[PDB]
Design an enzyme around this catalytic site. Sequence first.
Site, short mmCIF file in Angstrom:
data_model
loop_
_atom_site.label_atom_id
_atom_site.label_comp_id
_atom_site.label_asym_id
_atom_site.label_seq_id
_atom_site.Cartn_x
_atom_site.Cartn_y
_atom_site.Cartn_z
N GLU A 102 -6.16 5.22 14.60
CA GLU A 102 -5.23 5.00 15.70
C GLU A 102 -5.92 4.40 16.91
OE1 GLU A 102 -2.16 5.15 15.04
OE2 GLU A 102 -2.58 6.00 13.07
N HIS A 152 10.43 0.83 -0.38
CA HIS A 152 10.46 -0.48 0.26
C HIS A 152 11.49 -1.41 -0.38
CE1 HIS A 152 6.73 1.32 1.50
NE2 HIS A 152 6.46 0.33 2.34
N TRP A 178 11.02 -6.49 -16.52
CA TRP A 178 10.26 -5.54 -15.72
C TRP A 178 9.30 -4.73 -16.59
CZ3 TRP A 178 8.99 -3.51 -11.01
CH2 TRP A 178 8.58 -2.18 -10.98
N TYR A 211 0.25 -5.27 1.70
CA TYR A 211 -0.81 -4.36 1.27
C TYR A 211 -1.87 -5.08 0.45
CZ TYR A 211 2.98 -1.27 2.60
OH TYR A 211 4.01 -0.65 3.28
N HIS A 240 4.41 12.34 12.85
CA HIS A 240 3.96 11.11 12.21
C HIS A 240 3.04 10.37 13.18
CE1 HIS A 240 3.57 7.59 9.95
NE2 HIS A 240 4.69 6.96 10.27
#
Lengths: 250, 587
Positions: free
Chosen positions: B349, B479, B451, B489, B319
């Site tokens: 990164e 999550h 919902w 996000y 990862h």
Amino acid sequence: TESIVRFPNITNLCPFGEVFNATRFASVYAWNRKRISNCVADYSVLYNSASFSTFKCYGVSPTKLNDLCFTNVYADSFVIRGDEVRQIAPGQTGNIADYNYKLPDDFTGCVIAWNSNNLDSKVGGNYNYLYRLFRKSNLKPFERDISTEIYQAGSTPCNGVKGFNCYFPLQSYGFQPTYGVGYQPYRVVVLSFELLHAPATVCGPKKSTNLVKNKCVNFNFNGLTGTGVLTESDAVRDPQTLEILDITPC
Amino acid sequence: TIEEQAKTFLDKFNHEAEDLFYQSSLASWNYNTNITEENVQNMNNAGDKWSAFLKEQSTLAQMYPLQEIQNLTVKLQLQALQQNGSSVLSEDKSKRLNTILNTMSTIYSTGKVCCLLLEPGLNEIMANSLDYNERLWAWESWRSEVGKQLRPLYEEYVVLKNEMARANHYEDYGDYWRGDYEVNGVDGYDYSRGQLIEDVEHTFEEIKPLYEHLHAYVRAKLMNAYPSYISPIGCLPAHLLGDMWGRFWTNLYSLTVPFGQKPNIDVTDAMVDQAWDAQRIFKEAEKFFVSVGLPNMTQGFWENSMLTDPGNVQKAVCHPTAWDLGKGDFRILMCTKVTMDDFLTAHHEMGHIQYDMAYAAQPFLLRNGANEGFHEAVGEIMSLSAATPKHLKSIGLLSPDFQEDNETEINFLLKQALTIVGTLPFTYMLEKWRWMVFKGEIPKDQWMKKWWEMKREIVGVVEPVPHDETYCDPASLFHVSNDYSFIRYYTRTLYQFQFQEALCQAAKHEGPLHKCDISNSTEAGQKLFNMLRLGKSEPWTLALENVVGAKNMNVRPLLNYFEPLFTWLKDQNKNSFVGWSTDWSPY
Ligand SMILES: *[C@@H]1O[C@H](CO)[C@@H](O)[C@H](O)[C@H]1NC(C)=O
Ligand SMILES: *[C@@H]1O[C@H](CO)[C@@H](O)[C@H](O)[C@H]1NC(C)=O
Ligand SMILES: *[C@@H]1O[C@H](CO)[C@@H](O)[C@H](O)[C@H]1NC(C)=O
Ligand SMILES: *[C@@H]1O[C@H](CO)[C@@H](O)[C@H](O)[C@H]1NC(C)=O
Ligand SMILES: *[C@@H]1O[C@H](CO)[C@@H](O)[C@H](O)[C@H]1NC(C)=O
Ligand SMILES: *[C@@H]1O[C@H](CO)[C@@H](O)[C@H](O)[C@H]1NC(C)=O
Ligand SMILES: *[C@@H]1O[C@H](CO)[C@@H](O)[C@H](O)[C@H]1NC(C)=O
Ligand SMILES: [Zn+2]
């Protein structure tokens, strides 16, 4: 007409190799001062050792010091962080220059700092080296403090126990091989050249010639230059004969 | 004075915390690189020491008054340190809450459908099988297992978290989460809690037409895929989105190809032919960041960090992560092979790393991004800049000539929109539903109905079969069941494009914004670095002011980015119907 050079006769190599190549350097908070006198000093290999990360001379040029005399030399040595080497210089502040080592403004020496990440640092942390974090007042120039009394911040006296608002002053450096450049150990050596009205002891390395009388000639006695006629007896004392000589402008 | 007392306390803390955090991070890195025995106990010991130290420091700092401190930075550090968290509740309640979280995580980790787990078979089955019946069966089975198994656990979690958050002077747990975007004490930059409930629906109403046209185009393409299965006016099914939860629509790229004649840009064979040793990729990324004007990499970065997998004998996590262990140690853990995706991940990164090196001068408590979104936008914009044809032509891997036909631009923008603009409605709907559930305005008896009606209204997706009250669809998501915030996000997706537009305008680049490049523009690098170095010592409003000149988030650059795609969609959809109807159902 002619030039004569006269320095005291010394054939004892100056012990810089013992201080620079010491097995263990003292912690920054409690440093060790070495006194040097009665030697012939060779500042050539010292400057061009080609392995010093910083060689800054204050007061006098670093190259002319090869032909000058002082009364004696003081050499201090310790270990600090890479990023704190900047604070070892006159007119600097911080947590080192305030509480550990403050040089005075009329500094007349040199500062030599080189990396020592191979020796001091080890895996897991080398907690031998400590630095002072808290102190009631800033240090006076060239002063050492070794007391480890509990620094009091609050109103209530903690009576020498690590209570609330009371702190242990000395905090330990941590060193590891994988640290950054700004956190690796650096060994620092500070040279102070102190001179008084007493006759000089540290000189060289320079040759000497015979004394002359009359015959107006340029000269340098014990590092001070002059031109005139030397007459047996403004004036200087011979550093190897102990006779007063008078100078007359021809 | 209490001011000096707090300053001295923070002075001691900084050093203690730096030492303990370095020890913990080093142990964690040694575990992640070498996942063997005797490396787990060490990690557990280091983490326990760090957590106990943090709790004891919190207790000690709880004594000092907070309102007395007024340096606006010592006050920030003390306020950050004073967080009771779960210590307010009784020990039995805390143990029960920890047990609930652990068992929810365990149930999510261990799920069988029959044998068949979640990773990796089920996702791959849904990705490419393209069969109605088996995909419907898998979706329904996963829902009817996971949602059935986590209903009462989720209710108890909701009530416990709500009362715990109310114990800390907050309104609800949702308010506790929203409190991240809080700034006080600076006039002209204040941001209230309730202002974040706005600036999300208000900004989403601005982006409605683009999502509507994209939805209609995707609907038409699915009609092409499944002729007699979708009504022209009805909404899309939940199991035809190509993903388990419909969070990303990228899997639908194969079906919704704009022009199949012109292929996409692929230079993997170019790197393979020249035999890039997987180390020159990082050298190229470093050279890019130097050309922008940012600092060179540390010497220890190239020796301490690992880039190639250690081998078959020793197994390690692949990862990708960027570690900042403190004390001047920056490392990158990523298994690299030859692929364009690895190139862009290396750029991302190194963007993270160059962000980390910028604010290293700040104290320990203020070494983080200004808010929870600034850290990923900076990483993503580097990939956005390095994916352009200009920079790919700058290096020798791409052909110097190419074709740059407009079909390529349309295809690239369509593919990027399927991922970037197709996820905002889902994230917004999920976060809004969770906020309203935690607030208590939605009673227990109307969870699934609310919902699904919100899914019909906003995202325009209709379930295949009806669900009773015993089902629990939101808990299926990673999550949701692991107690994580999901609003990051949505805000990151907008900050990314705000930063990109600002940097491109500051670099005096002319032309479309979707083909902009930041390399060899030292002014843009300086402008970005002036904000990167700031850290968390300033309100995020002022930090945002240093880049774009605005004090709030905006969706206009995002709409301008997809402008050619917006025009093409308008032209292509001028004939087909626009809109969705919630009345129609698959059953
Ligand atoms: C210190 O040790 C080194 C290596 O043995 C040697 O070259 C040097 O002459 C010694 N003395 C000084 C002052 O560096
Ligand atoms: C060094 O100089 C002194 C001067 O007092 C003299 O007495 C001594 O003999 C000299 N040493 C020699 C010439 O080796
Ligand atoms: C991983 O840990 C084991 C445990 O002793 C050790 O033997 C091994 O050398 C470590 N791996 C590496 C690459 O050092
Ligand atoms: C405290 O106030 C001083 C004086 O304005 C300022 O320089 C400093 O950044 C503030 N914060 C800290 C942590 O010292
Ligand atoms: C934590 O709890 C203590 C208990 O009295 C309270 O005084 C303090 O204000 C609380 N702090 C926070 C941040 O909730
Ligand atoms: C590309 O440009 C040509 C020439 O104007 C045009 O005929 C074609 O329709 C364009 N294609 C797209 C996808 O815009
Ligand atoms: C930036 O300038 C360098 C010159 O050092 C050049 O090699 C490079 O190709 C330039 N970048 C672009 C994108 O043209
Ligand atoms: Zn990332």
